[PDB]
Design a protein around this ligand. Structure first.
Ligand SMILES: Cc1cc2nc3c(=O)[nH]c(=O)nc-3n(C[C@H](O)[C@H](O)[C@H](O)COP(=O)(O)O)c2cc1C
Ligand SMILES: COCCOC(=O)/C(=N\O)C(C)=O
Length: 363
């Protein structure tokens, strides 16, 4: 028996298998409005009782750092998302909307009035990283504006309102993007967070922002409709921590406490790992062992590694990114151990509604 096809109860959601669509920015949501193409794309990948997580979705006009990423902060965005959610639900899938603020990982071209991006810090991402521009070239990350605690509470309210909007659009839940060097990770990581106020310094202070974001969306829509994604050991966009395991465990501690205080469990904790392998595996297993709830692992998984993760108790669910780009029927291919299609990096972030998006073939 393939352990990826044993059913799993993710809170109130009965999943038929453990293969999850990882959240992936694809830049087809032209001018930040969800498009019919997104409906075709997610419908292609939906399975009865399968769990899907959307591309990162803007919570406010200042939250974007990629072209043509969808928002969920306007009524028009909610209206267009509803159409996509309806077609996904008609295939029997569960779908969560990932709420995403990029913080300092942006550019004047993505900001209203060309304003500076916001962050925990005034320090820019270093020169070894470059941002994809709307014309397909790569540009320099600018200096961000470090926000005060009043503005922090406004961003928290943006997460809260976007979570309510996601439920209005029919989403089963939301995922907080707290990974990969974006805004929340810019508070978590001591390689970024140089604050001297109550949001910087100690582990507890660096965890304050993610705790307040999660608390706000839990209060708005319920813990069982909230998943949280973090990546303590991934240093994307200069997001290094001096002790990734300690940071990860501090986050897990706060999530366990939110659950006790709310009297209910989160939908899940979702952790991406970098790709020795043994040290990374032990870090992941330690986070899983410490967290009181459902654990989704992600990052470089294959059919074999996903089977092993569930069989060994290292994870409850396994999310796949790049192979799901090029294999719309990845779930069926994993079930049959069928050959997988190659994915084309060149069309990860282009705008065509078909080419490199919905034209990868089925079996
Ligand atoms: C094109 C692309 C877009 C991605 N966009 C997001 C995103 O919007 N939010 C997020 O949390 N992770 C994003 N990721 C990371 C994936 O969710 C996932 O963790 C990674 O692809 C898993 O590794 P795998 O591709 O080997 O399966 C993206 C990855 C790719 C390749
Ligand atoms: C492909 O990069 C691996 C980690 O994923 C990211 O950093 C990400 N979003 O989290 C985007 C939009 O790419």
């Amino acid at each position: 028996n393939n352990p990826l096809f044993s059913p799993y109860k993710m809170g109130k959601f009965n999943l038929s298998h453990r293969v999850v669509l990882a959240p992936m920015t694809r830049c087809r949501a032209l001018n930040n409005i969800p498009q019919a193409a997104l409906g075709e794309y997610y419908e292609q990948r939906a399975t009865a009782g399968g769990f899907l997580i959307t591309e990162g979705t803007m919570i406010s006009p200042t939250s974007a750092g990629f072209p043509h990423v969808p928002g969920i902060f306007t009524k028009e965005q909610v209206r267009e998302w509803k159409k996509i959610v309806d077609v996904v639900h008609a295939k029997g899938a569960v779908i969560f909307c990932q709420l995403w603020h990029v913080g300092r990982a942006s550019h004047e071209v993505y900001q209203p009035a060309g304003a500076a991006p916001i962050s925990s810090t005034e320090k820019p991402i270093s020169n070894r990283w470059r941002i994809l521009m709307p014309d397909g070239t790569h540009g320099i990350y600018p200096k961000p504006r470090a926000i005060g605690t009043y503005e922090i509470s406004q961003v928290v309210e943006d997460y809260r309102r976007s979570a309510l909007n996601a439920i209005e659009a029919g989403f089963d839940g939301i995922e907080i993007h707290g990974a990969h060097g974006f805004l929340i990770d810019q508070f978590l990581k001591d390689g970024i967070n140089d604050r001297t106020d109550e949001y910087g310094g100690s582990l507890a202070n660096r965890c304050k922002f993610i705790t307040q974001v999660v608390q706000a969306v839990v209060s708005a829509i319920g813990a069982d409709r909230v998943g949280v994604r973090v990546s303590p050991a991934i240093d994307h966009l200069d997001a290094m921590d001096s002790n990734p395991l300690s940071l990860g465990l501090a986050v897990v501690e706060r999530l366990n406490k939110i659950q006790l205080h709310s009297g209910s469990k989160l939908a899940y904790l979702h952790v991406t790992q970098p790709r020795s392998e043994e040290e990374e595996a032990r870090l992941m297993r330690t986070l899983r062992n410490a967290y009181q709830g459902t654990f989704i692992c992600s990052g470089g998984y294959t059919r074999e590694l996903g089977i092993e993760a569930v069989a060994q108790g290292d994870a409850d669910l396994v999310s796949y990114g790049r192979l799901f780009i090029s294999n719309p029927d990845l779930v069926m291919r994993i079930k049959l151990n069928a050959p997988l299609n190659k994915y084309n990096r060149k069309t990860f972030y282009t705008q065509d509604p078909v080419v490199g998006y919905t034209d990868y073939p089925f079996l």
